[PDB]
């Protein structure tokens, strides 16, 4: 006969809606990750998750996972280098990188090169721009004494 | 470059290229070993890592080596050490060991396969899933849709 579906414990960094003492046939729930996390099943992403308690106390979908947003590798800078401030090769949400044009011979324009990984998956500067900085040649600089 | 969408590339573009137009006759996944310069042609010595489809190239398998040529006029360049998905139509020439050689032209599909760090990025995770889903779909069931 009718039974309660297994209790849906929240995945890490995810929140359940709506909360119920027990989930009976035809009750449903949805998972909403905290800001900076995305829904994924296996390695494939999910736009949104919603499951419903079906007959014999079984769910239609397996549990997903709230994974932190990854901005990916920083785009390389012409005549410049990229430095990881947060840690070696960490590109996840709220991580900071510092762009630097090659010293002495080049100077930076537009912005100062401090970029942080934003919740939308794009590296954003301190000003809020998503595009790369530009390195400008430094004229002059003769070796005469 | 890896997972780059053309302006006219609608969804399922890889399957349309492979099975509708120009209808691929061979589909390989190779790793570029070395580049040689011949008369009016550039020669890339490659090692096959995965085989998706073939017609004339019987006993083509992993760790088998092939030769991929492109005219010197074309702006395509295959840098050694990277892994590419190559599919097109089989040529008419053979190499020193007796294996067929391949010409890369407008009816050939060349795309570097994404690295592990890039593929799990939030932006490219959905696109990287389409590529692997296509490789498993085409590599198993072919064009018999």
Swiss-Prot record, chain A:
* Limits of the Sushi domain: 3-68, 69-137
Judging by the UniProt lineage, the source's domain of life is Eukaryota
Q: What are the cysteine partners in each disulfide bond?
A: 5-53, 33-66, 71-117, 101-135
What is the name of the protein in this document?
Answer: Mannan-binding lectin serine protease 2 A chain
Encoding gene (name): MASP2
Curated annotation (Swiss-Prot), chain B:
In its UniProt entry, what is this protein called? Complement C4 gamma chain
Report the residue ranges that make up the NTR domain in this protein. 1-143
Intrachain disulfide bonds: 19-143, 119-128
Name of the gene encoding the protein in the UniProt record = C4A
Tree of life domain = Eukaryota
């Amino acid at each position: 006969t009718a039974h309660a579906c297994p209790y849906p414990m929240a995945p890490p960094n995810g929140h359940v809606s709506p909360v119920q003492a027990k989930y009976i046939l035809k009750d449903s729930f949805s998972i909403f990750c905290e800001t900076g996390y995305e829904l994924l099943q296996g390695h494939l992403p999910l736009k949104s998750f919603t499951a419903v308690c079906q007959k014999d106390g079984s769910w239609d979908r397996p549990m997903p996972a709230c994974s932190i947003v990854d901005c990916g590798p920083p785009d390389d800078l012409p005549s410049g280098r990229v430095e990881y401030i947060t840690g070696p090769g960490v590109t996840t949400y709220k991580a900071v990188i510092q762009y630097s044009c090659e010293e002495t011979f080049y100077t930076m324009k537009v912005n100062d090169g401090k970029y942080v990984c934003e919740a939308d998956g794009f590296w954003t500067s301190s000003k809020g721009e998503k595009s790369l900085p530009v390195c400008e040649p430094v004229c002059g600089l003769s070796a005469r004494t | 470059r890896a997972l780059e969408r053309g302006l006219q590339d609608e969804d399922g573009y890889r399957m349309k290229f492979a099975c509708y137009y120009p209808r691929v006759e061979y589909g390989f996944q190779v790793k570029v070993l070395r580049e040689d310069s011949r008369a009016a042609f550039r020669l890339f010595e490659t090692k096959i890592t995965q085989v998706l489809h073939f017609t004339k190239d019987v006993k083509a398998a992993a760790n088998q080596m092939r030769n991929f040529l492109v005219r010197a006029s074309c702006r395509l360049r295959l840098e050694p050490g990277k892994e590419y998905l190559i599919m097109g139509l089989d040529g008419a020439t053979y190499d020193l060991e007796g294996h067929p050689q391949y010409l890369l032209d407008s009816n050939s599909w060349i795309e570097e396969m994404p690295s592990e760090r890039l593929c799990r990025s939030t932006r490219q995770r959905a696109a990287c899933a389409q590529l692997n889903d296509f490789l498993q779909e085409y590599g198993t069931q072919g064009c018999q849709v």
